[PDB]
């Protein structure tokens, strides 16, 4: 069996439900959406907020429980073929992370540069943001702790100890939700403009270098293949 | 839109906007729509934003929903920043081309190189017809017309579509051999030396070589086809012309200015004094971009905005005429539903409780006088 | 000789430099040369260039080839950095010693705080003589006449010597020994411990001492002879006396501006109306340093540089007397190689395309009317 489907429900659903989201605030961008203050906004984007903060709560909850319940307590005697095919599914794992890592940290990062150039800011919960800030980078930080998560009680290499390159590529990123602060507080009290290159702007800048550790998780991972069944065909 | 979230101080002592109009409100396609009306800059210019040093005359609107042909301060064209000074007056125009239809919510705003967006009034305007009819034909200098719709979109898009397929055929080439395991294993175990030999090399020269040739014909190509190139024209543009406004004849002191909290109502008590030789009345009292009339006195036929527009909001406790010389106190309510729904209530928020307004005498034979008040703003709950 | 590089609207829109005169063409060494003149202010200052609220009044000349004895902004002497008012109309006057034989293209230049150097006209004055007849004798507060040639060199030579005569003692008494491989060997090789022992450190506690004695003594006696000094006299001077120019006759208005690429000429469409009591002539137009002049109506007098004087340069389509009360609209045409020589045709490389300029309306008496001009410069090239 080895590499199975669950790649493609990997790839589809989040294709899937960002494109119904990029169709969600290209219909409710204007006419509720662009007045804050408005009775219409409230039902159309504070309540599109609350219900995925509590959503994104939820799903990481059960899922990161889910994930550390089911974790593999005799690692020892696992099979080297059930090794490989745990193998792929992390691999599989890290290809749904760089999807929504993707999604998150460029399309709708600088979908929210169009709406911070064509617009004036009317408050830190803007339909971009709110898809951005509050969807996007928690489905890419719960995305990432799950396959951290999965390697670490899956997976005999990244067993026995943290890696630090995916400590890093999976806090990192995350650190961009909690640099939100820095945004807002950098775009009401510093800069009176919309600079998409202002200082403001670099937390974001400085926590998108640390996805760079996704080169040292991956070298991590191909040892982890290679570990029994590394050959043999390479390197002979 | 992006209004009703600013301070409610910063609004009301930034830049009055009044005498405004608009040509058209509802526009085809292609049709124009003028912008008029005069801005004075206000003498207690807040310190924490930044004198109009450099200011740009913007339209707050939701993107390009029209194209703006031209804009003017002063009877001058003004493409770049200008440069406003504190306490002058400024009549405006901006030119407007329908481009997509829909109900759009045009502001006449002011952006300011240290304090953000200065927004004015905003008024609907409806377009009618297709995108697909709109034309944006400019001609050039050497003698050409073209349409800036879709001008070197051709282009544009051969360009960076033969850069991509060189970097993919770049990446292809050596993404045909396997490519991360056991490129890895030969790297670690013992010298590598093997996954890159020619003619490996004689294509890694030929990409080089090629690469460099190519975007030195591209850029001598494009020297000898449009050999007349100027650089972006920008820079801060000085010297506009003030409005000489006479002096007013009416000279008013604020003797103390509330608010009930919560309530929709400011009171205000004035000290009016009628210079001149006209008996005066009190018609108009404009805070920001709120104007409250006294139906009695004067009546707006301008197309004014409705929810910024109080017909009967001001109320005066002695609006009889004012006869020259003569000085009297009244006091001074305005009243409306927009003072609570563009959130002026919430002036108690701000750390600085100070408001300006314009104030609108009109004498018999309906000549006005605007005469400008600024005083601190005193809530009151008890 | 720094200028003809930088950018033609920063020259055509800084200060504009009129009235200039020169007391002599050829001077002997010790002689005085003294340059007058005006210099105004433009009203659009271009934003990159910061206000010169500090500026300095320099001289453009290669080294110190003149002494600056004096140098007045409205009568007074400004040795220091000066606040000059942007639209204001300044008289300076410069006095030059001369120092070294040669021909000398000198300057008249203005340094902004914030934005470089403004140069203006230069012409070339001749010195004959030796450098070895050169001086400058200051007489001081304290009574004393001194050479400012020479003053206190021997002093500073003497100090410098005696300081570098002592470190190359040290390193000398250091270096008697073998010094680096030896050296190397003894401190790697085991406890070095035996390449610094007494005297040597007898010999380090004697430089010290006597380093730290002599600095003290030096500076004693330094306080000692010359009791009486002050520091460095520095900070920029406020109240530049303006002139109190009358206010202009004429009124000219720039119906567009046009210069064909390439070419030596600018073309520019103007309407004057002529107020006041008496028929008027254009006779001069000044943009750049560049005074381009209609013979039959001007003629220059004041020895101004030839490279910079277009004696016809100046065409006007009908510049028949301009009675008062009338306006009329005349083709003027600025047409001469300085236009080319001084590049004042690279206007097209700048980011900024727009002139400014002096424009001299000379009645029958002869009196004459500043009126100055500004707007886009379009370029022509078909
Ligand atoms: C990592 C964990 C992530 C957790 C957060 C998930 C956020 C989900 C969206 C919030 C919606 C909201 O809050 O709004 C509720 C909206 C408000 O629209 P309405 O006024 O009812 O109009 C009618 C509804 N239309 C405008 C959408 C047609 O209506 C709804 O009930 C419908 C919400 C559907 C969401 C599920 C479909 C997603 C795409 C399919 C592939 C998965
Ligand atoms: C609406 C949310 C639906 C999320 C569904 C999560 C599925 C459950 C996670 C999981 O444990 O594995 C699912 C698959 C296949 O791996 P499994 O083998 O099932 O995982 C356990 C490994 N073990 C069987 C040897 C013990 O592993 C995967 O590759 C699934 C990737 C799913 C993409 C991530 C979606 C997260 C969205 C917030
Ligand atoms: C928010 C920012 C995160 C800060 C980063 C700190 C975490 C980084 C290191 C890390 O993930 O290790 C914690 C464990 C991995 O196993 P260990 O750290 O070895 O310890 C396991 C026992 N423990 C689950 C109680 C921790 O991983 C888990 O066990 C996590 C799964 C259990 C948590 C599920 C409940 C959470 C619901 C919201
Ligand atoms: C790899 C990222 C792909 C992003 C594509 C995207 O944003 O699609 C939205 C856009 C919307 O434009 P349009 O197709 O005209 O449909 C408009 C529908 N709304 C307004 C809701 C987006 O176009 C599509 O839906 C094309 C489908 C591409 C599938 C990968
Ligand atoms: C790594 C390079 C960081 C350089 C910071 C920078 O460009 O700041 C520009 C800003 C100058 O402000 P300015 O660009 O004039 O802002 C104009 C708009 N307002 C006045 C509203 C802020 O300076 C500061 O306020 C200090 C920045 C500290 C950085 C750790
Ligand atoms: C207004 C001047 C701002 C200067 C900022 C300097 C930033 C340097 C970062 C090390
Ligand atoms: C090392 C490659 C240098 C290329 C220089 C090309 C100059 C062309 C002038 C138009
Ligand atoms: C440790 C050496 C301090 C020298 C001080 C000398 C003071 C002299 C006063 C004129
Ligand atoms: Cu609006
Ligand atoms: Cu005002
Ligand atoms: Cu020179
Ligand atoms: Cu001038």
């Known amino acids: ?236 | 839109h992006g209004e009703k979230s600013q301070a409610a101080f910063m609004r009301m002592r930034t830049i009055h906007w009044y005498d405004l109009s608009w040509s058209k409100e509802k526009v085809k396609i292609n049709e124009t729509v003028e912008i008029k009306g005069k801005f004075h800059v206000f003498e207690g210019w807040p310190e924490t934003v930044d004198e109009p040093d450099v200011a740009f005359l913007n339209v707050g609107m939701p993107g390009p929903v029209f194209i703006r042909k031209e804009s003017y301060i002063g009877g001058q064209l003004v493409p770049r920043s200008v440069r406003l000074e504190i306490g002058k007056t400024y009549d405006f125009r901006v030119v407007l081309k329908a481009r997509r239809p829909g109900d759009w919510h045009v502001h006449t705003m002011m952006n300011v190189q240290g304090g953000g967006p200065i927004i004015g009034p905003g008024k609907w305007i409806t377009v009618e017809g297709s995108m697909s009819e709109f034309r944006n034909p400019v001609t050039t200098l050497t003698g050409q017309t073209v349409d800036l719709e879709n001008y070197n979109e051709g282009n544009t898009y051969f360009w960076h579509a033969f850069w991509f397929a060189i970097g993919v055929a770049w990446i292809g080439y050596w993404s045909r051999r396997p490519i991360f395991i056991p490129r890895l294993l030969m790297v670690d175990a013992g010298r590598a030396d093997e996954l890159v030999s020619a003619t490996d090399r004689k294509v890694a020269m030929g990409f080089l070589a090629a690469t460099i040739l190519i975007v030195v014909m591209a850029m001598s190509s494009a020297n000898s086809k449009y050999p007349i190139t100027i650089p972006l024209q920008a820079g801060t543009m000085r010297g506009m012309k003030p409005l000489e406004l006479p002096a007013p004849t009416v000279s008013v002191k604020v003797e103390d200015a509330t608010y009930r909290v919560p309530g929709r109502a400011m009171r205000m008590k004035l000290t009016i004094t009628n210079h001149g030789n006209s008996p005066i009345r009190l018609g108009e009292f404009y805070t920001a971009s709120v104007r409250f009339l006294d139906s009695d006195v004067y009546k707006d036929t301008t197309g004014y905005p409705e929810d910024l527009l109080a017909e009967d909001g001001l109320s005066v406790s002695d609006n009889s005429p004012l006869a020259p010389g003569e000085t009297r106190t009244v006091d001074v309510t305005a009243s409306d539903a927009a003072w609570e729904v563009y959130r002026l209530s919430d002036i108690i928020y701000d750390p600085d409780s100070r408001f300006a307004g314009l104030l609108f005498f009109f004498d018999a034979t309906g000549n006005r006088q605007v005469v400008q008040i600024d005083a601190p703003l005193i809530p009151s709950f008890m």
């Open chain 1, 1 to 236: 069996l080895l590499d199975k489907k669950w790649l493609t429900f990997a790839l589809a659903i989040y294709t899937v439900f960002y494109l119904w989201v990029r169709w969600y605030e290209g219909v409710y961008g204007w006419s509720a959406g662009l007045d804050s203050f408005a009775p219409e906004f409230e039902t159309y984007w504070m309540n599109f907020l609350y219900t995925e903060i509590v959503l994104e709560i939820v799903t990481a909850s059960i899922l990161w429980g889910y994930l550390w319940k089911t974790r593999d307590r005799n690692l020892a005697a696992l099979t080297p073929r059930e090794e490989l095919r745990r193998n792929f599914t992390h691999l599989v794992w890290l290809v749904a992370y760089a999807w929504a890592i993707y999604w998150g940290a460029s399309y709708f990062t600088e979908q929210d540069g169009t709406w911070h150039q064509t617009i004036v800011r009317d408050t830190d919960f803007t339909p971009s943001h709110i898809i951005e800030f509050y969807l996007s980078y928690p489905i890419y930080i719960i995305t990432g702790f799950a396959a951290f998560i999965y390697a670490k009680t899956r997976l005999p290499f990244f067993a026995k100890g943290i890696s630090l390159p995916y400590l890093v590529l999976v806090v990192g990123p995350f650190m961009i939700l909690p640099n939100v602060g820095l945004n807002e507080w950098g775009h009401t009290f510093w800069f009176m403009e919309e600079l998409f290159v202002a200082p403001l702007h670099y937390g974001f800048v400085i926590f998108g270098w640390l996805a760079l550790a996704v080169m040292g998780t991956l070298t991590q991972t191909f040892y982890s293949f290679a570990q029994g069944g590394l050959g043999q065909s390479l390197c002979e």
